[PDB]
Amino acid sequence: HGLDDAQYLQQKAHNKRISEFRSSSNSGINVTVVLKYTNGVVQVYNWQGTEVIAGSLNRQLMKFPNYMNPDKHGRIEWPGEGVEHQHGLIRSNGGNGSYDIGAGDPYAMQFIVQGSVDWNATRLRFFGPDGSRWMPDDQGGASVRAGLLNAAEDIINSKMQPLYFCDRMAGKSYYVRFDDKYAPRFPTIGFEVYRYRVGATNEMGGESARTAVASLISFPTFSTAYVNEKVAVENFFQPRELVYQNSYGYTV
Amino acid sequence: HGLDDAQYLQQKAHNKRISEFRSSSNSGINVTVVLKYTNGVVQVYNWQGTEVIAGSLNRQLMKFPNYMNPDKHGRIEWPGEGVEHQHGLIRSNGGNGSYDIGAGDPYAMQFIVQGSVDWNATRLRFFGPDGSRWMPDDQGGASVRAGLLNAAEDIINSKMQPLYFCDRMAGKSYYVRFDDKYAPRFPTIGFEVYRYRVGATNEMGGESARTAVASLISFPTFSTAYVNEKVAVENFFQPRELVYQNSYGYTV
Amino acid sequence: HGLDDAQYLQQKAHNKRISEFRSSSNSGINVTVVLKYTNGVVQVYNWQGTEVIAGSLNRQLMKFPNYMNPDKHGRIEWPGEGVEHQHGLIRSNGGNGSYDIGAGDPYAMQFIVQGSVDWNATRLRFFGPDGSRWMPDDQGGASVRAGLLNAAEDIINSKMQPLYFCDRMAGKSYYVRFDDKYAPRFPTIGFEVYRYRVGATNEMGGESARTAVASLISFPTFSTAYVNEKVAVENFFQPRELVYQNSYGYTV
């Protein structure tokens, strides 16, 4: 020895760089919403950002198919799951002529956050299909006069499960069923995710204001629907090195 | 007496809390755009936020049906109201083969703002179908070189009508016809609405910068189209406790 | 002489006002993305703003037709260019049953920025069809762990061509082919464009924070598709006084 210590060190320096770079304010943080349907389809929305990642999905995007991801025949609605159906979700007995639950009404979601993130600061907000603020403990959806838009329960960090990649925690995942218990049966969502900062300077304001504001919407949002989770994982999540928890509880 | 003063006080404390909570920076402010069509349909877009509410609608969303709200048959365009029609709106005599005015070209809008709002600061901006800045006094739509994006007339507060809920003013509404007089015949819109602050600390910046920026897009936008105003009011506005001025000038 | 010096001066004052107004923080800055298709179609997206203009397009909007601009028959997808096709773009050999290259997959884009702009500060970011960060020098699309979201090469100013209107430079244009050389063959994009400031006060923060943040999304985005560049120029760009470089290298 040591014949190849230089090659070894270079590989180590490469591994260190790539792993620690996640801490840079100029690396990416990822937020993925994965919607699950009773036919096995998963619909994926993936947002990226540097300092802040914020977004929402209304019922038009929570359902499948939709204008973003039509079905194989190019349809953005299914018979009996169109406007009349949506009206029956907005208001109890306010519908006409539709399936009671849509094949395209998701039954659960996985919310995955990855990167060097201020985990404690993550907000995930649930609303009813009409935009009413939904709260836990079965009080129903709140009106606009009574609705607290920033509730204690939006802070989901403690319920998120750590997802590891090699020896580091790469992200966290929250799995929830849409059953009117821990989330609405027909929810819409908003979320905010924030960069973990390694110093005290506020990079969302001051000399950083211009780029902070621009960064909110200057990264494309990826979306598609996959026939099943198996295909989604091999063709999207794995190659992007995005951690994901599968239907069996395993990190993949 | 007084046998039930405690129950009375508790109800009073409940009523006070819910009514005054609108003043909290963490309550919701609502902006609703209601588009009216000559077949009686109303198309609703409802934005919510805490400190700032901002948004826009281009012609693709000003018209009905569209990708957000297809018609009962799942169509996002009507024959003779498709691309050729849109081209004829963008530029005078720039179309081919389309209805002169679309059944799905709205004839009026109600712009409703509700919550504890800095009313004086509200902006509503009108643009032509091509994105040209539209100004009052019939000068036409302005080019990009001449277009003032923040005009005196964007400040619509004085033209808005107060809408009361019980003994308090809950919101304000502005009704306008799309007739090239007080608004374009084929408009597109942008708006900004701002929280009324009860103190001097700037919650859009400084220590509040990160959440201020995130809040711009972290609440889902509700949208649907209803067969008529009557149905919209009973199934959406009333239950959400959103004030709304009906076709007869009444607050409902 | 001079019989009409007053009329002359007034016209000169008018010309000076309109030309210099571009420098006002309350004038408009324009960003236009023009996508080019092998059937001659051009698809236009035009954003406006005062201090900052930021945005993105994912594959659903990079392609033609789409939910924003259906084809003449109202279709938002073409056979063999639907979900299966998109899957084959997201991941090599991850598709089934689709055209190898879509008629609706653009082959090039012109990115045009106009107004009083901090030219040096412009960012244009390229990503693959899966949202992977794309870098020059053929290293492929980067994973999320390794992806630098703000790279040196995002600063495209030096590659942009100046476009003049009369005696002033009105904007700059960047033309690029989607050929895996200087941009991805199947790209998605994000961009940030910033106001040139004539003073040192930061109008993206401080006392300007509230309007700065609101301005990010309070101007409608114009979009349409035109049968060819000739028609687009005469019916949209020319009347808006938006500079544009045609297929022959001429400013029009």
Numbering used by the authors:
A (entry chain A), B (entry chain A), C (entry chain A): 2 to 253
Authors' text:
Cypoviruses, members of the family Reoviridae, subfamily Spinareovirus, possess a single capsid layer with turrets and are commonly embedded in crystalline occlusion bodies called polyhedra, which are formed in the cell cytoplasm and mainly composed of a single virus-encoded protein, polyhedrin. To ensure the delivery of virus particles to the target intestinal cells, allowing the transmission of packages of infectious virus between hosts by oral-faecal routes, polyhedra are disrupted only when they are exposed to the very alkaline pH environment found in insect midguts.
CPV5 has insertions at V3 and V2c which form two hairpins resembling a clamp. There is no obvious significance to this change. The full length polyhedrin structures are generally well ordered, as expected for a crystal lattice which has extensive interactions and low solvent content (19–25%), however some types show regions of flexibility: 13 residues (136–148) of CPV5 and 6 residues (68–73) of CPV14 have high (>40 compared with an overall Wilson B-factor of 21.3) B-factors, whilst 13 residues (66–78) of CPV15 could not be modelled. In CPV5 V3 (179–187) and V2c (135–140) form clamp-like protrusions which fill the GTP and ATP pockets, whilst in the SeMet form a calcium ion links four polyhedrin molecules. CPV4 has limited numbers of molecular interactions in this area, while in CPV5 a few strong trimer-trimer interactions are present. The V5 regions of CPV5, 15, 17 and 19 differ, but all end in a similar place.
